[PDB]
Design a protein around this nucleic acid. Structure first.
Lengths: 88, 119, 35, 216, 52, 60, 159, 85, 217, 113, 63, 76
RNA sequence: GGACUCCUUAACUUAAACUGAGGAGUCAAGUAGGUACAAACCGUACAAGGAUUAAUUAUGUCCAA
RNA sequence: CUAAAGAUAGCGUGAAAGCUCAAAAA
RNA sequence: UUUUUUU
RNA sequence: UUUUUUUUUUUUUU
RNA sequence: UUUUUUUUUUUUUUU
């Protein structure tokens, strides 16, 4: 009875390991042969996220470059609009 | 016999492109309704209070929530808050009494042999 | 699923976390923030 | 290694904290063994056979707490025995668990009496007779079926274990000095002597009968 | 160390007999032989006895 | 060769007010073995410093 | 909110970290360590670490403190304790213990009469014998033969 | 091979100098590749805490306080167990 | 013939709760290399020996790779082969010295490498693809190859690689067939004498010894 | 599955008769009481019905004594004040296993009274 | 010969020892007066702590 | 009785000063909870140990911020 | 009546290198360096010209180096 | 020996019988 | 040139 | 731990 | 428990 997980269903179940083609876990039951479970058909694994990208993933991500051109511009800073400036 | 209550209601509407529409010909018709459930919001709760105060050795019951947590599209965590305080605990008193009895016993045993003076 | 094209290869060390033509950067953040 | 999984990243691995406290196989372990335990040094007197273990098991083997060992050797109706005039070994330790290892008892049993096992035979016409003399074992598996030559096993296990059969031929006893060998032999025998659940014609290890079945 | 210990032991030659605590076994079956890589024989078609 | 890595050597030299380019260093290393050894010995003295107290535990 | 990693990702990697808590340092090393010794009485590692810290902080620690630390280390391996002789041998085979005994030997001349019984008891407990201090201790014992109490005389004879 | 384009995850697997037997296993999920070695995937037990190497930096403080298992697989008494993704 | 090979994990415990879940060996327990019981004389290994020659200018380095790591050994060998250890190193030419390796069979490999490692050999326009050969076969047939390939893949990818490769000598056995070169392993010598006896022998009373012997007899 | 072939033998297994004689209140007298209670247990009564057990209380200060006779005619005598339940069994384990071996050979262990 | 420095054996010294939780737990139990022989508080056993403290703290007599 | 109305509920804990040029984040990372005290007096800054504060805050094994937390008399 | 990326956001299947907005960098019109392999990412005391010289930067320090 | 033992938690049969667990003692 | 395990 | 080992097992807990 | 990561260009894991 291949299953994607393992659980203790009997009163005397024991988590063992079978020497199959590959090391595979399993559950053996003495009072019921039907409860014999073998974890050999799991779900496909996903592609994990690298650790080094953690800093730039979680938390408030502020803009890299700030905005200053809109707050920097002035008539005095332009030769075409400087003469029109009047302090009187 | 038990009572339950819901804390989230489906009111946000969402549209979907009908099968047979071009790239862009305006917004599609309403498809279904969803509820914007942010993190930390409660979904279901049972006001029922654990009556078994002098029995802290038993964990709560969450079979009902276990039966539906796989269904939900979000990870859920069980919770159970009560009015039970530390000060009002019998564990402390039991501990105290055990300590006292131990001490008493020890004292008695030392005094019996007479290896040391009394008082 | 999003796994064939080159706009989804993670940044490795010394790239700035935003190389040319990336989508997964903004996908994961969005996902976490709400899907 | 260095890669977060989707479950632990997004979901945060919340499944482990989504289990119920009901329909459990076993009751929770009582949290009684709290602060206030007083340890003491226990000592046991074992027969002089454990000397065969040597220092490699008592000193070389690493352990959490020290494991001392001493050998009290003494020069040599009713068996009126006392605590004096005989040899023995003192094994003392602070952990009672170390004073109950199966190896210590095996060191004595292997060189004193050894081990044994039994197999019971059942079924109509099932008989386990003997050839002219050892080593030649034949077992008949029902009426009309040819016997099974079991000489291979006996030759394999010669001088390590021996097989005995009662007059009736319904019991297969195995006697040996090696635990492993004995067990292996027994199970080897039972592998081809296993009984059918329907006809119930074969062999079985004692205290483990097979359940009967019927067709619908 | 081995040299020095051998020299020390050379000065105390054995006097009494040694005592052994080896494993007990059925010595009677010493003359038996076991063949591993032994093929199964089929002399005759109808088998009178099954050879495992 | 003389059990003195470049890593150490560089530091040792610089700490000494020594201003010798890698070109001359390398040329010396090949043409003037003795000269090079002199430099290495000079550097080692500075690099390797003893503490204020020395303890002997040979007989203990 | 923001994460520490995020913040740190835009600063030199070798940049030092600010201090959150600052308190005055201990003015008197002997008085500072005497109070610390009051808590370590069962853990040999704590005693050894305290001695190492004092040795690193000062080149000539207090002789009374050194004697007290040696007695504290010796007391742990008592006769009624469950410790083994291998644990005493490996302890004797440590460099820090050799440094402590060397420090005691250097200024052995500052040994008081009342500190001899404790040194002998520690020697008996640790099964460690020296020809560097025992000859001096015996001189004091014989000199003050006519002043020791009966229990001390018996314990010294047994040791 | 004949396929023109392949997934990066598949490609990665394709580059593993191992036997077919282990390749299949790896593909399936019964086995993992890490540090140039193949080992059994981590085991997630019900109620017990997961390894500190798999949780997020901010989750380690809470993970360390959970119960831990210091026994063998035979002695394990977990109601349910599965591989940690 | 009809089933998968018997791995090393088939003969031991399995511990999933650990880094080294199962130990792996090139051969079975009953198949591991061993020495003949009748030693005609005892031998001792010199670790490494070196021969200089000013006239011909060809230097030799004989090493003992007994219980050493393949990677480390390879790494070390590479240095010598390249000749980077000398002051007068010229990348254009091969400034290295001849290297001899013995006891290659005794090498070790950490992790599950003996049972989960293979080697690929490219084929020019072959439908079947590259030929795959397991490491157990290579160990069985020619152990030296294990080190040889590691060194080869370590050496720079240039036209000098063959040259550098040629000078390398690896043997599974103890001794070598070379004529004019010292042996790493030489017959053992008599231990040095000691100027002191670490024993204190004290005989007992002959009468009591005889009485005890008679009682025991 | 996992079959249990070997099983430890009970203290009262293959025993013909047992006799106990001790003085209540004597130091190191727990063995006697434990043995008595074991002998007069329920499990014992069911597993070994043909067992002859008896205890005596001495009216004077005297050392404890335990006498055990097996089915094969072997006899043993021990002091409760210098031994334990566990230690005692190791002294006569050989004869007990000899008798059990003979019984095993001769008959099946699954028999019932 | 210097070239072959990698082949040299080395053994650093032991900075500090290592002990198990039970080994450390037994030490405080012994110090508190629960040694192997018995309870010092219940009965004064040999090499006790209180007697040693007094005799070694007041060894000299009063003039 | 145990459940009597004549029972005190006050707590007494120590605090640490808030150093100059110190952020909330720094303190938080250090293993402390920053706090301030503000009415009927000058504004004071303190830091309370996490393991000490959280223990009072979350006085249940399967609970969140308790109601009682805001119903006490802290003697800082 | 513009191609990639950062923050906010409209549309879409919280899809797509699309479709369209608000404000910073780069390319367009940028060299050499790093990121394995082909503008957009990091860094630059950023390419008038010549020579066998010294430096805290992204970042590295088992081998290819 | 004393103490304790759910209207009955897990096996079993044809309506039964029988075993085990909890509790108690050690 | 590995660390930790209060009293 | 024993060539016990196609999906079958023993011993010892390392 | 830690040093060893997407080191996923190759070798190697020598701790």
């Amino acid at each position: 009875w291949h299953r994607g997980t393992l659980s203790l269903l009997c009163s005397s179940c024991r988590y063992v390991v079978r020497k199959w083609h590959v090391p595979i876990l399993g559950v053996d039951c003495n009072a019921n042969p039907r409860h014999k479970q073998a974890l050999s058909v799991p779900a496909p694994r996903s592609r994990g996220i690298p650790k080094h990208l953690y800093p730039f993933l979680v938390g408030k991500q502020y803009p890299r470059h700030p905005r200053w051109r809109q707050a920097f511009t002035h008539r005095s800073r332009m030769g075409k609009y400087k003469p029109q400036v009047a302090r009187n | 016999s038990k009572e339950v209550h819901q804390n989230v209601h489906a009111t946000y509407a969402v549209t979907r492109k009908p099968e047979g529409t071009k790239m862009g010909q305006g917004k599609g018709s309403i498809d279904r309704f969803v509820a914007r459930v942010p993190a930390g919001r409660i979904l279901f709760h049972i006001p029922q209070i654990n009556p078994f105060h002098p029995f802290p050795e038993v964990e709560p019951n969450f079979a009902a929530f276990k039966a539906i947590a796989p269904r939900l599209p979000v990870p859920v965590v069980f919770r159970e808050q009560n009015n039970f305080f530390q000060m009002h605990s019998v564990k402390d008193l039991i501990r105290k009494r055990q300590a006292e009895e131990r001490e008493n016993r020890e004292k008695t045993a030392r005094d019996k042999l007479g290896g040391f003076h009394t008082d | 699923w999003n796994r064939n094209p080159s706009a989804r290869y993670p940044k490795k060390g010394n790239k700035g976390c935003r190389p040319v033509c990336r989508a997964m950067r903004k996908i994961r953040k969005r996902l976490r923030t709400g899907r | 290694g260095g890669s977060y999984g989707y479950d632990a990243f997004f979901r945060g691995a919340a499944e482990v904290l989504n289990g119920s406290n009901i329909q459990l196989p076993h009751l929770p372990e009582n949290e009684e063994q709290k602060e206030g335990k007083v340890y003491q040094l226990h000592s046991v007197r074992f027969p002089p056979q454990v000397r065969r273990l040597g220092a490699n098991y008592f000193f070389r083997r690493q352990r959490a707490v020290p494991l001392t060992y001493y050998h009290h050797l003494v020069e040599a109706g009713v068996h009126a025995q006392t605590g004096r005039g005989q040899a023995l070994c003192f094994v003392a330790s602070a952990n009672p668990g170390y004073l109950q290892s199966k190896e210590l008892e095996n060191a004595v049993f292997e060189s004193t009496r050894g081990f044994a096992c039994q197999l019971i035979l059942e079924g109509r016409g099932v008989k386990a007779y003997f050839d002219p003399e050892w080593p030649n074992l034949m077992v008949r598996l029902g009426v009309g079926v040819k016997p099974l030559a079991l000489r291979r096993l006996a030759e394999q296990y010669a001088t390590r274990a021996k097989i005995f059969v009662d007059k009736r031929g319904l019991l297969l006893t195995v006697h040996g000095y090696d635990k492993c060998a004995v067990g292996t032999l027994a199970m080897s025998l039972f592998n081809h002597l296993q009984a059918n659940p329907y006809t119930m014609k074969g062999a079985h290890v004692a205290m483990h009968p097979i359940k009967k079945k019927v067709t619908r | 160390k081995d040299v020095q210990l051998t020299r020390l032991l050379a000065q105390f030659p054995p006097v009494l007999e040694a005592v052994k605590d080896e494993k007990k076994a059925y010595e009677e079956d010493r003359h038996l032989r076991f063949q591993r890589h032994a093929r199964q024989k089929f002399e005759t078609w109808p088998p009178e006895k099954l050879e495992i | 060769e003389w059990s003195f890595p470049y890593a150490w050597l560089a530091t040792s030299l610089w700490r000494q007010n020594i201003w010798l380019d890698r070109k001359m260093l390398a040329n010396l290393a090949e043409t003037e073995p003795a000269s090079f050894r002199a430099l290495v010995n000079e550097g080692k003295s500075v690099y390797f410093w003893n503490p204020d107290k020395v303890r002997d535990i040979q007989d203990l | 909110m923001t994460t520490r990693e995020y913040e740190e990702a835009f600063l030199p990697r070798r940049l030092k970290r600010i201090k959150v808590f600052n308190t005055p340092p201990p003015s008197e090393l002997p008085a500072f360590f005497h109070k610390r010794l009051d808590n370590a009485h069962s853990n040999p590692r704590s005693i050894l670490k305290l001695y190492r810290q004092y040795m690193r902080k000062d080149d000539y620690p207090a002789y009374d403190w050194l004697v007290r630390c040696f007695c504290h280390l010796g007391n742990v391996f008592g006769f009624n304790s469950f410790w083994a002789t291998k644990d005493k041998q490996v302890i004797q085979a440590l460099p820090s213990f050799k440094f402590l005994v060397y420090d005691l030997i250097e200024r052995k001349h500052l040994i008081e009469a009342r500190q001899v019984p404790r040194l002998l008891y520690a020697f008996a407990c640790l099964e460690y014998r020296s020809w560097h201090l025992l000859p001096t201790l015996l001189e004091h014992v014989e000199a003050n033969l006519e002043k020791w109490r009966t229990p001390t005389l018996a314990n010294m004879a047994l040791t | 091979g004949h396929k023109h384009s392949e997934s990066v995850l598949q490609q990665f697997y394709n580059r593993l100098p191992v036997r077919k037997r282990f390749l299949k296993a790896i593909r399936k999920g019964t086995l993992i590749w890490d540090k140039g070695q193949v080992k059994i995937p981590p085991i997630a037990m019900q109620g017990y805490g997961l390894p500190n190497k798999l949780v997020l930096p901010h989750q380690k403080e809470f993970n360390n306080k959970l119960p831990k298992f210091k026994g063998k697989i035979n002695q394990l008494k977990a109601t349910r167990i599965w591989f940690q993704d | 013939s009809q089933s998968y090979p018997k791995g090393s994990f088939h003969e031991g415990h399995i511990n999933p709760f650990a880094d080294v879940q199962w130990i792996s060996r090139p051969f079975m327990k009953r198949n591991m290399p061993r020495d003949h019981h009748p030693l005609a004389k005892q031998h001792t290994s010199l670790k490494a020996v070196t021969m200089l020659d000013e006239e011909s200018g060809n230097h030799w380095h004989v090493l003992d790779g007994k219980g050493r790591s393949v990677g480390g050994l390879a790494a070390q060998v590479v240095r010598l082969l390249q000749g980077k250890h000398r002051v007068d190193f010229t990348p254009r030419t091969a400034a290295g010295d001849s290297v001899i390796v013995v006891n290659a069979i005794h090498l070790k490999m950490a992790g599950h490498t003996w049972d989960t490692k293979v080697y690929k050999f490219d084929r020019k326009t072959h439908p079947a693809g590259p030929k795959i050969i397991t490491a157990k076969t290579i160990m069985a047939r020619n152990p030296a190859m294990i080190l040889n390939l590691a060194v080869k893949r370590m050496l720079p990818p240039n036209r000098l690689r063959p040259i550098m490769y040629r000078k390398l000598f690896v043997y599974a056995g103890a001794l070598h067939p070379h004529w004019q070169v010292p042996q790493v392993i030489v017959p053992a010598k008599t231990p040095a004498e000691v100027s002191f006896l670490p024993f204190s022998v004290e005989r007992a009373d002959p009468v009591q010894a005889a009485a005890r012997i008679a009682a025991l007899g | 599955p996992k079959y249990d072939l070997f099983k430890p033998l009970d203290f009262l297994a293959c025993v013909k008769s047992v006799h106990v004689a001790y003085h209540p209140g004597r130091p190191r007298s727990e063995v006697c009481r434990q043995l008595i209670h074991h002998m007069k247990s329920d499990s014992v009564r069911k597993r070994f019905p043909s067992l002859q057990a008896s205890y005596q209380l001495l009216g004077y200060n005297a050392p404890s004594t335990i006498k055990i006779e097996l089915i094969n005619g072997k006899k043993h005598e021990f002091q409760a004040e210098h031994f334990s339940l566990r230690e005692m069994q190791m002294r006569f384990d050989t004869d007990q296993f000899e008798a059990y071996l003979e019984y095993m050979k001769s008959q099946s262990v699954e028999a019932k009274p | 010969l210097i070239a072959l420095k990698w082949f040299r054996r080395k053994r650093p010294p032991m900075r500090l020892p290592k002990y198990s939780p039970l080994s450390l737990s037994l030490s405080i139990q012994a110090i508190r007066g629960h040694g192997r022989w018995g309870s010092e508080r219940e009965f004064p056993r040999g090499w006790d702590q209180l007697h040693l403290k007094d005799i070694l703290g007041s060894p000299l007599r009063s003039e | 009785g145990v459940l009597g109305a004549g029972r005190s509920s006050a707590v007494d804990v120590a605090c640490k000063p808030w150093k100059r040029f110190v952020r909330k984040e720094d303190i938080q990372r250090a293993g402390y909870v920053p706090c301030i005290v503000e009415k009927y007096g000058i504004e004071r800054r303190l830091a309370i140990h996490r393991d000490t504060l959280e223990a009072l805050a979350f006085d249940e094994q399967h609970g969140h911020l308790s109601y009682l937390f805001q119903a006490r008399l802290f003697r800082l």
